[PDB]
Design a protein around this ligand. Structure first.
Ligand SMILES: CCOc1cc2nc(C[C@H]3CCOC3)cn2cc1NC(=O)c1cccc(C(F)F)n1
Length: 289
C-alpha cells in the first residue's frame, strides 16, 4: 500500500541529499540509523530518511531495522503515529509525510527561535504520544526507542511517534545487543531485557521533559540526568514547581502535579511497579477532564 521509489528519484528531490541544514540545504535531523532530509515531490514536501551506519551497525542489522519500519507502519496506522508514504530499496530510504513542526525535542528547546509550547499544547502532546504508544502495545509491538526526538509534531502540533526500526513483537526476553538512548532507558533495558514496561519508563522521561523543558541529559547541568530530579523531589530537596518550565504562562499547579504523578509512576525502577500504557492513557485523560 506504500509507494515504491527508486533511489534516483529521492536523490534528485533532496538536492542530491544536501547535507547542509535547512536553516543554512536539506538536512533536518540525524539519528544513529540515518539522516532525515527534506524532499520536494510533485510540489509536496516530504521527509526522506536515508539509512546509514553511524553507531557501529552492520549491513544486515540496518536492513533488518529497515524492514521492521515498513512492517510496523504497514499494519499500524494511527492518529499518533507517523505516516509512511513509500521507500527505496535499490542505500535504504523511507519517505514520510512531512511533519512541519519537527520534533518535540526541538520545540521544547525552542530550536531556531520557535515560540515556547504552552501548557495546553503540552498536555495534548502528552496525551497523543500516550495514545500512540498504546496503539503499538495493543498491536503487540515494543518500541524500544521512545524519546522526545522520536515524537514529531504535525501542522496541528499533534504528536506522532516515529522510528520503529528497533521494534519487537510482544507475546521478559533478552538480547545481547543493548540499543537505545541511555538517558531515556529503564534499568532492565540497559541490562538487555526486552519488555513493553521499558517503553513506559522512557515515556516518563519524556513527561519530565514536557514539564521542565529540560533535555533528558545535559553534561553541563546538575543533575546531568533529568530523571534524577525525581529523587530530589521524593527526598524533598525541591518540588516539581521548582523545575517547571518558566517559558509558559498557562501552567496550573494541579494539572502539572497530575502529569508529574504519571511521570513518577512511569519512572518506577522496578518494572512491575510501573503502570501499563493504558493506565497511563487514562491518568493523562483525567488530568484535563
Ligand atoms: C529528525 C528531525 O526531523 C524533522 C525536523 C524538522 N524540522 C522542521 C522545521 C522546523 C523549523 C521550525 O520548527 C520546525 C521540520 N522537520 C521535520 C522533521 N521530520 C519529519 O518531517 C519526519 C516525518 C516522519 C518521519 C521522520 C523521521 F522518522 F525520519 N521525520
Amino acid at each position: 500500500r506504500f509507494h515504491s521509489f527508486s533511489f534516483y528519484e529521492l536523490k534528485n528531490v533532496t538536492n542530491n541529499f544536501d547535507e547542509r541544514p535547512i536553516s543554512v540545504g536539506n538536512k533536518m535531523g540525524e539519528g544513529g540509523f540515518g539522516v532525515v532530509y527534506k524532499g520536494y515531490v510533485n510540489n509536496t514536501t516530504v521527509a526522506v530518511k536515508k539509512l546509514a551506519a553511524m553507531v557501529d551497525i552492520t549491513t544486515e542489522e540496518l536492513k533488518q531495522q529497515f524492514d521492521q519500519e515498513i512492517k510496523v507502519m504497514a499494519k499500524c496506522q494511527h492518529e499518533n503515529l507517523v505516516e509512511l508514504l513509500g521507500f527505496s530499496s535499490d542505500d535504504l530510504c523511507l519517505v514520510y509525510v512531512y511533519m512541519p513542526n519537527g520534533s518535540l525535542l526541538d520545540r521544547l528547546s525552542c530550536l531556531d527561535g520557535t515560540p515556547p509550547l504552552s501548557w495546553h499544547m503540552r498536555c495534548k502532546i502528552a496525551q497523543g504520544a500516550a495514545n500512540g504508544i498504546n496503539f503499538l502495545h495493543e498491536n503487540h509491538h515494543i518500541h524500544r526507542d521512545i524519546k522526545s526526538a522520536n515524537i514529531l509534531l504535525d501542522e496541528a502540533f499533534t504528536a506522532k511517534i516515529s522510528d520503529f526500526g528497533l521494534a519487537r513483537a510482544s507475546e521478559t526476553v533478552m538480547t545481547s545487543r543493548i540499543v537505545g538512548t541511555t538517558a531515556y532507558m529503564a534499568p532492565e533495558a540497559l541490562r538487555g531485557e526486552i519488555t513493553p514496561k521499558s517503553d513506559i519508563y522512557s515515556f516518563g522521561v519524556v513527561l519530565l521533559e514536557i514539564i521542565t523543558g529540560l533535555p533528558a541529559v545535559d553534561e553541563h547541568r546538575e543533575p546531568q540526568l533529568l530523571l534524577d530530579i525525581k529523587e530530589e523531589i521524593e527526598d524533598e530537596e525541591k518540588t516539581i514547581e521548582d523545575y517547571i518550565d518558566k517559558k509558559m504562562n498557562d501552567a496550573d499547579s494541579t494539572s502539572v502535579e497530575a502529569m508529574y504523578s504519571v511521570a513518577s509512576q512511569c519512572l518506577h525502577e522496578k518494572k512491575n511497579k510501573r503502570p501499563d500504557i493504558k493506565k497511563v492513557q487514562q491518568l493523562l485523560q483525567e488530568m484535563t477532564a
